[PDB]
Amino acid sequence: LDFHGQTVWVTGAGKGIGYATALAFVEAGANVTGFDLAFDGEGYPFATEMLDVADADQVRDVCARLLNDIERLDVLVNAAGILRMGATDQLSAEDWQQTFAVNVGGAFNLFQQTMAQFRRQRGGAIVTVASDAAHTPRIGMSAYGASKAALKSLALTVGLELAGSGVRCNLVSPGGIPLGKIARPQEIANTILFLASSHASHITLQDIVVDGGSTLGA
């Protein structure tokens, strides 16, 4: 999978799946910009933008400024996300609010700021990290799964809104079933790179669940 010369944006890039995906794109030759609230790790071999992707004004300022400097946004990866668990009637107001602000609002803001670019360039790919909790109800994850279901629905309608522009828009949903150990970020990133690649050129509005089969196909 070769991404030489391509411009790639990744949110949630300070840690977890976003970091692994940014790194995988850098190793595949891409020019990568990572977005996250904090960059507290010891090494980032890509350009970083430290902001709250849940904040519509911050995303507007930064993305408008960067789009003024690039010719093409080849790949957007939405990988921001937080997990706050609890019985539905015990979850705090803060955990409910922040779950939706980050897990749905972040991608919404990125979409608001990039859809015109995707339309005007024709083409490109978007991959959004959802969750298998969006596919089946999971005790303790009512808010998390609901936020990821909103995110998936949003990303699919964006994919329909951009299909006439030739943009591909897909999702990955991370976690003897489960089959194997839980998937590492490095392996989620492999699936994102596949969906971002020319080897997936007629794949859009799809969601690959990468959880060892735990949803039994749902």
Tally of CB atoms within 10 A around 88: 12
Backbone angles phi, psi at 206, to 5 degrees: -105, 155
The answer to whether 38 touches 64, Cβ cutoff 8 Å, is: no
The answer to whether 193 touches 24, Cβ cutoff 8 Å, is: yes
Tokens of 144: 């998390």
Which residue in the list 63, 128, 144, 158 is annotated as catalytic?
144
Amino acid (1-letter code) at residue 144? Y
Q: How was this structure determined?
A: X-ray
Name the DSSP letter for residue 200. Answer: G
The answer to whether 182 touches 212, Cβ cutoff 8 Å, is: yes
Torsion angle of C-alpha atoms 169, 53, 147, 207, degrees rounded to 10: 20
List, as residue ranges, the binding site.
17, 36, 52-53, 79-81, 131, 144, 148
Residues 6+ away with beta carbon under 8 Å from 7 = 30, 31, 33, 70, 71, 72, 73, 74, 75
Tokens of 65: 């400024």
Tally of CB atoms within 10 A around 54: 22
Strand order in the sheet with 125-129: 47-50, 31-36, 7-11, 75-78, 125-129, 168-174, 207-210
Tokens of 211: 């959880």
Catalytic, 144? Answer yes
The answer to whether 78 touches 110, Cβ cutoff 8 Å, is: yes
> Residue ranges per domain, the chain?
1-218
Backbone CA torsion sign across 30, 185, 102, 134: positive
Resolution number, Å: 1.8
Separation CA 22–CA 79 (nearest Å): 10
Helix locations, the chain, DSSP H: 16-27, 56-67, 93-100, 106-121, 142-162, 185-196
Separation CA 58–CA 177 (nearest Å): 42
List, as residue ranges, the binding site for NAD(+).
17, 36, 52-53, 79-81, 131, 144, 148
